């Protein structure tokens, strides 16, 4: 021991360093996150748009100045307003997964008290690169 390095894949942010959560763990944790008063949103991002970039620094004179690129995720049709059902979320995840083979699908949520968004589990695509 110990040789450490992501081989044939990279670390896609929080929860990538641990083994990937299952659909059952995600559904149970969504029910818990709803119970604790958080408001879910389903979001997705293209394979090269979910991995950090700074190429766009070419267009602007003042850099790096807190600016970042290719970390923006697009929302899947609607946020979970009114209804919070994990089976509606599961149908939307399957429809999203079917819609984009080359995009990652992830769940995020927010706390409306000061309006802060939490980016949670899990970065998944039907062509996810090598497991650690």
């Amino acid at each position: 021991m110990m040789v450490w390095t992501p081989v044939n894949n990279k670390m896609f942010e929080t929860f990538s360093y641990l083994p990937p959560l299952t659909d059952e763990q995600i559904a149970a944790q969504v029910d818990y996150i709803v119970a604790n008063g958080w408001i879910p949103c389903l979001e997705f991002a293209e394979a090269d748009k979910a991995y950090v970039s700074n190429e766009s620094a070419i267009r602007f004179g003042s850099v790096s100045c807190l600016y970042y690129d290719n970390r923006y995720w697009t929302m899947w049709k609607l946020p979970m307003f009114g209804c919070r059902d994990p089976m509606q979320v599961l149908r939307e995840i399957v429809a999203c997964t079917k819609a984009f083979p080359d995009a990652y699908v992830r769940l995020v949520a927010f706390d409306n008290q000061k309006q802060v968004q939490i980016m949670g589990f899990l970065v998944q695509r039907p062509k996810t690169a090598r497991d650690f």
Partner: protein
């Protein structure tokens, strides 16, 4: 009197001139609460009134020329005072000041008037500041945090678990390629943020300018080769303000995300000017804190944690430092949780069980984020997460730089423990009892955490409850 008083020669009784135990506050009044013990032979209302008189007008022989200034509602007033239950000769004094007496948001004038002149007196044995009432119009002429918690959450581009880091040691003298190697490997291994110490910034041969350039080469790849948003808290320290400004302006050129400064170990007005500069250039600003034995721990005789948290936030900072648990800074339950509440939150009325004697009116005051560091690792992660949640900004000092497999498996083990604790928290687990079994469950194939838990098998400490000054 509003002016024009022909006072007879000699000092008039302070209890007949600056003591008002029926006073009711105005919305623009500035109030201060002090814990005091007079020298044996001085009445506590005479002491309270004398403090109000010396911080307002002051005298060493009053005559008609003290009648030249307008006194009336423009002078300081000592309100009704109460005994301290802990000690017979100790009392809590409540002193009011009107807005007419101080320059608008003038920190050295307010500091000198309230603390500078007051905390001296030969016939005063001990005096401790307990609370302050800052009226909203003085709160807003203070500038507060530049990029506080509701701004910092959206600025850092990720959130939903604590922010994982480590404090770089040895403080002495680490050469640029071994520093570059250690920083690159631990950031690429799993840390969100790394931190410098004061000696690490500048040394007789190694200039901050060149240390920053090795940080720049490393940081570009320590995001680019990992994929996840990370950075490094540069620690920035300097001998003169010209050096501080040179250090600021040269790092503005590359516009790096969050840095820290011990500028607020140097002086209050240095941080206030910098916080305005940081606000102007859209930065993020971490505030260091030190001197805990001679500032924070001044028992019955000076500064306390709640007044320190109010004073620190009424200059401002986005992150602010905060207990090491063991070693140099605090780790106590009845100290930290109040201190953190007074930094995190807005709109909350005074409570004597939390030691709050005065409410500063609230509604639009930014939060500021505690940064703990964190000498004990793996087994104290359950208790830390259960006590503090997704406050912190946990900067390890044994974690990472205490792992005999190197910086990457060290950082990976700390990252695995952070994610494992956060997954346990997402599962609604009873973290104080479940967390040990979660760590054992993780250790099966995280080998890195298995090595971390064989290496740190001795540490089992949680927190002490009661304040230890």
């Amino acid at each position: 009197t509003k002016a024009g008083a022909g006072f007879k020669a000699g000092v008039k009784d302070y209890r007949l001139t600056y003591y008002t135990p029926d006073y009711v506050v105005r919305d623009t009044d500035i109030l201060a609460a002090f814990r005091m013990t007079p020298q044996l032979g001085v009445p506590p209302e005479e002491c309270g009134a004398a403090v109000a008189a010396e911080s307002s007008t002051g005298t060493w022989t009053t005559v008609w020329t003290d009648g030249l200034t307008s006194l009336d509602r423009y002078k300081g007033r000592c309100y009704d005072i109460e005994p301290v239950p802990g000690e017979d000769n100790q009392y809590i004094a409540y002193v009011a000041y009107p807005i007419d007496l101080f320059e608008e948001g003038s920190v050295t004038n307010m500091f000198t008037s309230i603390v500078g002149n007051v905390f001296g007196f030969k016939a005063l044995r001990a005096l401790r500041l307990e609370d302050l009432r800052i009226p909203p119009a003085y709160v807003k002429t203070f500038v507060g945090p530049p990029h506080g918690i509701q701004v910092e959450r959206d600025k850092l581009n990720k959130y939903g678990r604590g922010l994982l880091g480590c404090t770089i040691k040895p403080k002495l003298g680490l050469s640029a390629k071994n520093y570059g190697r250690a920083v690159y490997e631990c950031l690429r291994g799993g840390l969100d943020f790394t931190k410098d110490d004061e000696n690490v910034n500048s040394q007789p041969f190694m200039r901050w300018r060149d240390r920053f350039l090795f940080v720049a080469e490393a940081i570009y790849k320590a995001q680019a080769e990992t994929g996840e948003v990370k950075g490094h808290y540069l620690n920035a320290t300097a001998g003169t303000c010209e050096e501080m400004m040179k250090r600021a302006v040269c790092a503005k050129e590359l516009g790096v995300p969050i840095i820290m400064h011990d500028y607020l170990t140097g002086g209050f007005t240095a941080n206030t000017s910098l916080a305005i500069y940081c606000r102007d250039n859209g930065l993020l600003l971490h505030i260091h804190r030190a001197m805990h034995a001679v500032i924070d721990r001044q028992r019955n005789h000076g500064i306390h944690f709640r007044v320190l948290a109010k004073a620190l936030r009424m200059s401002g900072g986005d992150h602010l430092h905060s207990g090491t648990v063991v070693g140099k800074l605090e780790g106590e339950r009845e100290v930290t949780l109040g201190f953190v509440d007074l930094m995190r939150d807005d709109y909350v009325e005074k409570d004597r069980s939390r030691g709050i004697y005065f409410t500063q009116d609230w509604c639009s005051m930014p939060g500021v984020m505690p940064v703990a560091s964190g000498g004990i690792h793996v087994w104290h992660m359950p208790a830390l997460v259960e006590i503090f949640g997704d406050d912190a900004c946990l900067q390890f000092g044994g974690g990472t730089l205490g792992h005999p497999w190197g910086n990457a498996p060290g950082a990976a083990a700390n990252r695995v423990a952070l994610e494992a604790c956060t997954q346990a928290r997402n599962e609604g687990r009873d973290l104080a009892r479940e967390g040990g079994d979660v760590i054992r469950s993780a250790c099966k194939w995280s080998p890195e955490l298995a090595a971390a838990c064989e290496v740190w098998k001795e540490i089992k400490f949680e927190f002490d409850t009661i304040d230890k000054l």
